Write an enzyme that holds these catalytic residues in place. Structure first.
Site, PDB file in Angstrom:
ATOM      1  N   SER A  75       0.773  -1.284  -0.016  1.00 29.70           N
ATOM      2  CA  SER A  75       0.059  -0.051  -0.386  1.00 29.70           C
ATOM      3  C   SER A  75       0.929   1.013  -0.241  1.00 29.70           C
ATOM      4  O   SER A  75       1.819   1.447  -0.577  1.00 29.70           O
ATOM      5  CB  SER A  75      -0.733  -0.010   1.203  1.00 29.70           C
ATOM      6  OG  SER A  75      -2.072   1.068   1.076  1.00 29.70           O
ATOM      7  N   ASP A 118     -10.882  -4.579  -4.220  1.00 30.71           N
ATOM      8  CA  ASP A 118     -10.619  -4.062  -3.882  1.00 30.71           C
ATOM      9  C   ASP A 118     -10.362  -2.517  -3.231  1.00 30.71           C
ATOM     10  O   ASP A 118     -10.603  -1.552  -4.202  1.00 30.71           O
ATOM     11  CB  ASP A 118      -8.576  -3.427  -3.547  1.00 30.71           C
ATOM     12  CG  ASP A 118      -7.677  -3.077  -2.499  1.00 30.71           C
ATOM     13  OD1 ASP A 118      -8.472  -2.199  -1.886  1.00 30.71           O
ATOM     14  OD2 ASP A 118      -5.979  -3.861  -2.184  1.00 30.71           O
ATOM     15  N   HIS A 160      -7.184  -5.143   0.305  1.00 28.09           N
ATOM     16  CA  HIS A 160      -6.694  -4.347   0.151  1.00 28.09           C
ATOM     17  C   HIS A 160      -4.467  -5.469   0.942  1.00 28.09           C
ATOM     18  O   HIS A 160      -3.464  -4.822   0.403  1.00 28.09           O
ATOM     19  CB  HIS A 160      -7.318  -2.987   1.081  1.00 28.09           C
ATOM     20  CG  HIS A 160      -5.324  -2.251   0.958  1.00 28.09           C
ATOM     21  ND1 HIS A 160      -5.077  -2.185  -1.092  1.00 28.09           N
ATOM     22  CD2 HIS A 160      -4.718  -1.562   1.282  1.00 28.09           C
ATOM     23  CE1 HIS A 160      -4.081  -0.812  -0.012  1.00 28.09           C
ATOM     24  NE2 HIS A 160      -3.939  -1.063   0.535  1.00 28.09           N
TER      25      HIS A 160
END
Length: 271
Positions: free
Chosen positions: A98, A221, A249
């Site tokens: 991320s 996601d 995610h």
């Protein structure tokens, strides 16, 4: 005062395994190095594995924190650079989750010779919707809303946001874990981190990346929709895209096996 050790302490730096190359793993927002527990140890056999924490993680001295430095993601990119200098590395593979992928990307633009590859797990260059060209997945008001909730009811935000990033109602254990991780993180620092991460826009910086990059896109996601990974693949000069079967995610914690596979296949092909 004794800077190499001070950096190693501030970022809880650890090195494991052995090999000709090294792989640095960088956590996502609200996570410490332990989120990599299910993935990282699979690479100790053939590589030196580097783990580290961003400032502000519960068991953190916090006496290493600095208000200004971490106001933007650059301060975070600087930590990665600091660790690389302390470890005296000439080059390393970088695996980030991320926002960790973007932090790694930023540091690579500043010091490209330091990174051989950029493995991005669920990256996003911008979380804001910008039709017709870009669909980040969020309206400014939605992000502004979560920020507000972070201030008013942190614990409440922790459980709401945890549910959102996982997007897997039939997987409560990983859910409760992320929630705990969010509750364990300093709230003042977390809010500064969230603001810096969810309001930044790196779309104009994609074209500057000169280090090879692998984009692992997750299914369903909410944080980083399929459109953002496709867009990143398109604008990053040297990249490849891989759609995971993994949902949510955080594949490194909900689907470690596939995560290990894809990263392993990639390094196996570019060695």
């Amino acid at each position: 005062a004794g800077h190499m050790t001070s950096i190693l302490s501030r970022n809880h730096v650890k090195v494991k395994g052995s090999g000709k190359a090294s792989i640095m793993f960088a956590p996502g927002f609200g996570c410490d190095q332990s989120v990599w527990n299910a993935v990282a140890p699979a690479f100790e056999e053939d590589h030196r594995v580097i783990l580290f924490d961003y400032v502000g993680s519960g068991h953190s001295d916090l006496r290493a924190y600095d208000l200004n430095r971490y106001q933007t993601l650059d301060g975070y990119a600087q930590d990665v650079l600091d660790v690389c200098e302390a470890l005296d590395l000439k080059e390393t593979v970088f695996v980030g989750h991320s926002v960790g992928a973007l932090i790694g990307m930023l540091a690579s633009i500043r010091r490209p010779e330091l990174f051989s590859h950029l493995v991005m797990v669920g990256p996003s260059p911008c979380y804001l919707n910008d039709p017709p060209e870009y669909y980040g997945g969020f309206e400014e008001e939605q992000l502004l809303g979560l920020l507000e909730m972070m201030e008013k009811n942190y614990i409440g935000w922790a459980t709401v946001f945890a549910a959102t990033v996982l997007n897997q109602p039939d997987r409560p254990e990983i859910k409760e874990e992320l929630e705990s991780r969010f509750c364990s993180t300093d709230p003042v620092i977390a809010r500064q981190f969230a603001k810096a991460a969810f309001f930044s826009d790196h779309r104009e910086d994609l074209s500057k990346v000169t280090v090879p990059s692998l984009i692992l896109q997750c299914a369903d996601d909410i944080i980083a929709p399929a459109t953002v990974g496709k867009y990143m693949h398109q604008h990053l000069p040297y990249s490849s895209l891989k759609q995971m079967e993994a949902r949510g995610h955080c594949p490194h914690m909900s689907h470690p096996d596939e995560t290990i596979q894809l990263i392993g296949d990639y390094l196996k092909a570019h060695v």
